[PDB]
Amino acid sequence: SKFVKVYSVLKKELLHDSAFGLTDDSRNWVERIMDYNVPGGKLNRGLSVVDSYKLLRELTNYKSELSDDEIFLASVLGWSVEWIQACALVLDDIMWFRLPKVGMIAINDGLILRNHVPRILRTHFQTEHYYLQLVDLFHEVECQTIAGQMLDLITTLAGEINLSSYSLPVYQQITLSKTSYYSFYLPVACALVMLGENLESHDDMKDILLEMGTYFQVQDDYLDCFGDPEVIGKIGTDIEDNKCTWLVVQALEHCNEEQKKLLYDNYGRKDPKQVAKVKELYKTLNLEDLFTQYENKTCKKLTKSIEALPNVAVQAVLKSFLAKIHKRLK
Amino acid sequence: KSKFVKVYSVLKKELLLTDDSRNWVERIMDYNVPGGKLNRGLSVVDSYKLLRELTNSKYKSELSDDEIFLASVLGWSVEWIQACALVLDDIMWFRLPKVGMIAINDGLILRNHVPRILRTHFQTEHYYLQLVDLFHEVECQTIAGQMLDLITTLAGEINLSSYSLPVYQQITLSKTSYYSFYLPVACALVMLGENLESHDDMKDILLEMGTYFQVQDDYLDCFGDPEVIGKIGTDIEDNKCTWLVVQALEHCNEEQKKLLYDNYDPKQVAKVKELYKTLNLEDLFTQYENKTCKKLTKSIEALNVAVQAVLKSFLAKIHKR
């Protein structure tokens, strides 16, 4: 319910005393990029820092209080997460010779945004013990995000010509490196490092959180096709947009040459009739049930692995995440 | 001369206790980083040598063995950056994302080495944080160039009109110019204990000097003495976004544009290079070269003469090669 006012705070800090942002007209220029890319509603990820910090602190042990400045710093890390998300997504909406110019514009927008996170961390965490551990954490996620984004770029462009480019290892690598790292690992890891701990003793939680991010994106991908548009509020467009959906990949693995030509001849096309031809081929593969298998299997696998963690509070946080994502329609 | 024995010790500290896949990481390291040339590592040391031989605090002498070591450690960090920047240039339709996935993860392994190098060897210095800023800046500019070059090279397979001067200049600037010319000098400067944000004028010079160097490369790869270079120019065959192609596409506004579209086999490649000749291009190079050299010489002399001596040394080692 609390509205995270911190966004305007950080914008005022960066746009004033910092290192750049001198000319009034450059200050306005930077602000337009900032507000177009970062505070785009949703904000489920950055708060998950706060929910994680709140549950970790409520269940640890003595030293036990609650400061407003603590909430402030946790929310600042949450906004750093939203900045990372913004940089990861800069290249997602493409719509030939006009393409390098468009990419150059987008790249340089995201280039501007990547140079804000270090200033935020320095301004607000220079003096803390865990500052370097935080910078390590963000450099890891930053570089993994960048790797996934570069692979996604190769795939989406090579996906325009010949759909056979979409494969399960490529989809899983993009989903893991581009998305899963910043979305699920980084929030909890931020709450952990701010409590003054070392991530090198939580490698088991990382694999769980990373796989849950892949599960969350496979959840997303499935909903973008079979999810009651009246509940979502919008119609699934992934098939029109020629996206690298979990569904398309699993189809191309299990389909045959007659079904492959059906996918080659229809997928990507704007024609609605063809999108339905695709969705019917998805049903014809009985994919829905394969999804139910993947979901049930992943949930049991994660539940088992989670309950085996020592820190019971971490177990509570991951269980909270899993129970909030499970079989969701939103 | 300086036999840089030390890569063994750097690799040994990093490698060394890791399952038995240690060799796999080691093969990526020595396949990608040590190439022998190492012009991106020695220019670091030579630059520190000139910057150090200028600060006349008492009597100019020789750098301590530990000093040479740390300067060489940064130069090799530079070589790591260079290796990561170039991981994707030997790309070779589909099958591109699988190849790219291998390459990106190779560069990811090497990208996770530079922070460990700096921490092990610069944890205690004042300027350590300035190093992390500098390397993240150059790394991110490098990554930006790689993404634009990627989009551009793919859009270069489809329609030759895609290659344009702003895209070429941005690629040259972000992908190459930062680590090649700025980064060495900036490393030597940060070890001298200086704030890079007081040298923005030198940065503009070095970045343009890197773009100037790549236009030079493009020119030699086409109108050279292969006996002096030791290699035949393939850029026109390889369908690269050459300085020549963009300048051609600006001026070829008729049947000459179609002649170039129906090209890119040496039977055709010779028709291209002859069409390049038709546009007095050699003269445009000499004009661009003389103009940029005088402009850069002016901007440099317009600058701490120590910075000027280093930049002038770079330009005099590059000029008209």
Numbering used by the authors:
A (entry chain A): 6 to 66, 69 to 102, 114 to 348
B (entry chain B): 5 to 20, 27 to 102, 114 to 285, 289 to 327, 329 to 346
List passages from the publication reporting this PDB structure.
To investigate the molecular properties of the EuTPT proteins, we determined the three-dimensional structures of EuTPT3 and EuFPS1 using X-ray crystallography. Similar to EuFPS1 and other prenyltransferases, the EuTPT3 subunits were composed of 10 core helices (α1-α10) with a deep pocket that included two DDxxD motifs responsible for substrates binding.
In EuTPT3, α6 of one subunit interacted with α5 and α6 of the neighboring subunit to form a four-helix bundle, whereas, in EuFPS1, α4 of one subunit was inserted between α5 and α6 of the neighboring subunit to form a six-helix bundle of α4–α6 at the dimer interface. Furthermore, EuTPT3 conserved a hydrophobic hollow in the bottom region of the dimer interface. These observations suggested that the longer polyisoprene products may pass through the hydrophobic tunnel at the dimer interface.
